[PDB]
Structures are given as C-alpha cells and as structure tokens.
Ligand binder design. Structure first.
Ligand SMILES: CNC(=O)CN1C[C@@](C)(C(=O)Nc2cncc3ccccc23)c2cc(Cl)ccc2S1(=O)=O
Ligand SMILES: [Cl-]
Lengths: 299, 305
C-alpha cells in the first residue's frame, strides 16, 4: 500500500556528473564516454559561434570529483556544448538520448558544482516548462527515466523563468517550448492540467481503496472534453483512453466511467475530502508510473 | 525558486542492496563491509507470524540456509547473529561499494529518503517523515521488507530505518539499523493498529517560513500568541504540541525572514481557523508537515524574496 511521488534511483546518473567552468561561469556537465555535455551558455544578445571560436581547449575546466579532466576538443549542437575529454568515464551507463512529450514525467538529479544534492520527480507541463526546484548553479543538471538497464536522458536544465518555473533542452540542445538561451522578456504560456494523468491518479486512488468519488454514471468523450476545456484541462484523446485500458481492466472501472467521476470533481469539488492525501487533483503521474508503482518494477 | 519534496541521491545506497532468501521467503538486505543486515522475519513462514519464537527458529538454521545474491554474484554466508529484530549475516566478501556510513535512530518529525527495493533490486526513491505515531506513510508492496531509509549529510550516509511490516491501515513500521522498532510495534502478526496521528507542527511552521522566503506572505497577520495559547488551539486541530526546543530550532528561519516564531504561530492559528479560502501556499492546498527546519534551510536560498 501507499502512493508517493517517486523518482527513479539516481545512481547511474550520479557517476556522470562533472563540474564545468569557463572563466567566471560555473555549471554542471554530463560525462558520457569521452564527452562532457553542458549548456552552451557556459562560454558567456549572444553570438555563440563568435564566442566559441575565441575559446581554447584549456579555457574549459572540467572537474570530476577531485580529479581534473583535460579538454581536447569542443563542438556545439544546438544549445548544448560538447567537450571532448581526454579520458572516457568508467561509470558510463547504458544510455539513450530521448525527446519526451508534454505530459510525460521524469526524475531530476539537481546538482551544484558537479555534485548531486537531491533527486525529485516532475512532469513536462503542456506549456513546456517544468515546476522544478532549482537555485543558481543548477544549470546542466539532467532529467531522466530508467526503462530496463537503459537511462534515457530527456532534459538538461538551462534557466528559470520570472514566475519560478524552469526551462531546458533535450540532450541534443533543442529547447522544450518557445524559449531561447539569452536574457530577454520571455514568460511561461498559460498552463493546462494533464487530464490523462489526473485520471491515472484517480485509478491509483481506487487501487488503494479510495472509492468515494465514483458514481453510477458514465459520459462520452465529446461531452467530457467540452467540460474539460472549460476548466483549463488538456483535451482527452482516443489514444489516452486506450492507454488507460490496463488500469480500467485492473480496477473494473471503464475510462468513461472515471471521466464522469472527474467531471463531478471538477464541477462541485472535493467537499472537504482528500484523494490520496491531496486536496488538489494531481497531474504528475502518467498511466505507466501508476502501473509501475502498483506492480513493483525493479532496475 | 521552486520548492519540491526532494529525496537524497540514492546512489551510495543502491550499491548496498542485496537479495536475502531463507527457504521460501525472499526479502532485501543491506550489505555493509562483510555483513548483510535484513529483518529477522525472513526465517518465518506465514504460520510462524502469529506467534514466532525467533531464537528457536534461528538455532535450527545454518549459514548455507541463507542465500544472499548481490547482482548476479552469489554471496557465501559464514556466520549469523541477531540484534533485536534484525538478522546480521557475516558474508565471506566485503562490499567494495561500501559508502561512509553511520547508524542513527531518528525521532518522530525527522525526514528521510527511502530506496524501495524488490529482490535486492532498487525500483524507486522517495522522501518521507517519521510520523508522531511512529509509522511512515510509505509506498511498499510485498517483497519490499529490508528496504532502507537514510539521510546523506556530507560524504556520510546515516542509515535510520529498515522496513519490516505494513499495518492494517496501509501505513508502515520498521526498525532502526540495530533492529529496535520505532513505536510499540512488534514483528508478530497480532492485533496492532497505528495510534492517532498528529500534524508535525514544527515542520508546518518551517514550511510556512519557506513560503515567506519564496515571497508568499498572504497568510501573515498583525497578531502574535503565547506558546501555551498556541498549543491549546493546536491540540484542537490534532497538531503536535510545540515545545521550547522547537522554537529555538526555528530561530534561523525567524531571523532570516524577520517574523518571530510566535508571530508565525499566530498565522498558523488563523490558517487552521479559516482554511486557505481557495489560495495555495507553495503550490499546495494542505499545510505540509514533511519538511523539517533543516530540510527548508538545505533547499531554500539564504536570500529571502
Ligand atoms: C498487509 N500486511 C500484512 O499482511 C502483514 N503481514 C505480512 C508481513 C511479512 C508484512 O507486513 N509484510 C509487508 C511489508 N511491507 C509491505 C507489505 C505490503 C503488502 C503485503 C505485505 C507487506 C508481516 C511482518 C511483520 Cl514485521 C509483522 C506481521 C506481518 S503479517 O504476517 O501480519
Ligand atoms: Cl532525529
């Protein structure tokens, strides 16, 4: 029993965190094989092609623990700097670089000075920002999932927006959302609630014996989406319904049965009650996260 | 900016998780130096759970009856002792990834990270607090016994909890790393239920100071209170009594924000009285009690907003 927000074990990622210093800037880097990946703003209206051509190999100080790493090459892929190091990382795990979609969750290993300080789980919001916990010097700290023996790296931290939300790139340097890596007037767009995740969390509540929100009623996909659009909820697609199939089967509550229960929670509220110890409807647990936490999947 | 419930990096603990099997039962073990620590109920069947005689069951077991598996490698048991509710298996090889560690007994209110494992394989990490009733609201399915709770302060992993059982209400009970249970729980299948739980008041106040540090001041007021008058109101809402020790501990946060501890107690008294009225403090619609004053200082900047 019990339902918690659970990050993946950060162990295979901790062995990859190094500290990158270029002049006055000091951020974190990801050491995979003979390459260290970090935000391209470490060299810093910027002209990165012009700033980078002026930098020598020894102008980058990569420190892995107490050992000092020697930079022997440097290239740039989008908003990520790739520093060819003289030594390959002995603790390099099995990895993939993946681009996740808004709604999908991941673990973040928050680091400062190439030293990991904490791990937490979060979701890529529909507006492309992440509600993370970052202070100055956290740039370069990565987001990941572990599926089997493979660490799929999905996010690299770049910046904090005026409202306290965060923006970063995939491991190829492509930003998530309309953000650019420079100091300009940029703000987070209007956010929506990830509907497929709220439903998955309602299924986890029933799996844990919380059934107060259920009712005899059902609804249709269109009638539910009209109501959801009014409460700033992401539209629920036929793909979403199919994905909630294993949970619908395990609990015996049809996806459109659960949609009628959500419609009612959205209309009249919790009425002083809590679902899984929460007074808000949680949207940072994907249907796979729910299945994985209520099965016992190990790595 | 941003305030999240944050577990410690589980890396130094992952390298210590092994799988312990005795007969038909299979749980997790903690491999430190040449010793594997695990719950003693590993030597029990389901029948033995009603009234077990652990000394009588243990005397019948030899080293080769324990199958410790670390990854793919099979570990050889060369000795076995018992300290309270934990079994200590002397293994033939010392763990090469043994981190710098301490065994600590935490007090109700204190927080820790849990590395949930199944078959000596870690599956997830999460942060939780030792509740005033001595249980933990964790996420544990069958096969997770022997999963541990820890804090990492500097290069040291202080092990504070080992998971043993789940109570009828879905809450969890375990021992310190010396096998001494937290609370009046016993490793027996008997009629035992979690006592009435209360809200950790010192932690709610710490979390209210973390909200002021992040520029959330809507809940503050022009009132103060005496420690006794606050506790009389707090008991009515099932809150833990605030002690003079608690006030002293909140000193740095009181100073950093410029809000006296009893000033914040007045805002908490009013918050309990009125509710949130549709507002949220640090993105939450409930008052959070699983962030200690030490966790707030560790996560939050020294520069108030
Ligand atoms: C649902 N809980 C139970 O039926 C508890 N019983 C089994 C057991 C082994 C126990 O608690 N095992 C579990 C631990 N954590 C999590 C669990 C989740 C699911 C199922 C068992 C879980 C045990 C251990 C001790 Cl120390 C005392 C009594 C008992 S017991 O025989 O009463
Ligand atoms: Cl303590």
């Amino acid at each position: 029993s019990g339902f918690r927000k659970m990050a993946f074990p950060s162990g295979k990622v901790e062995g990859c965190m190094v500290q990158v210093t270029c002049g006055t800037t000091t951020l974190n880097g990801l050491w995979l094989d003979d390459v260290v990946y970090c935000p391209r703003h470490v060299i810093c209206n910027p002209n990165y092609e012009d700033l980078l051509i002026r930098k020598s190999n020894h102008n980058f100080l990569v420190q892995a623990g107490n050992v000092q790493l020697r930079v022997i090459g440097h290239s740039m892929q989008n908003c990520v700097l790739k520093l060819k190091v003289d030594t390959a990382n002995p603790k390099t795990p099995k990895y993939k670089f993946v681009r996740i979609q808004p709604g999908q969750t991941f673990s973040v290993l928050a680091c400062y000075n190439g030293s990991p300080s904490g791990v937490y789980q979060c979701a890529m919001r529909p507006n492309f920002t992440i509600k993370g916990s970052f202070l100055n010097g956290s740039c370069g700290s990565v987001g990941f999932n572990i599926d089997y023996d493979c660490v799929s790296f999905c996010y690299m931290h770049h910046m904090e927006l005026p409202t306290g939300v965060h923006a970063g790139t995939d491991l190829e340097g492509n930003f998530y959302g309309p953000f650019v890596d420079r100091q300009t007037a940029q703000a987070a767009g209007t956010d929506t609630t990830i509907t497929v995740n709220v439903l998955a969390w309602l299924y986890a509540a029933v799996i844990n014996g919380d059934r107060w929100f259920l009712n005899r009623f059902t609804t249709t996909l269109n009638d539910f989406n009209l109501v959801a659009m009014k409460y700033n909820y992401e539209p629920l697609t036929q793909d979403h319904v199919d994905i909630l199939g294993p949970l619908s089967a395990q609990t015996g509550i049809a996806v459109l049965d659960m949609c009628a229960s959500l419609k009612e929670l959205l209309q009249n509220g919790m009425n002083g009650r809590t679902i899984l110890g929460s007074a808000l409807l949680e949207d940072e647990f994907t249907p796979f996260d729910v299945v994985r936490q209520c099965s016992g999947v190990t790595f």
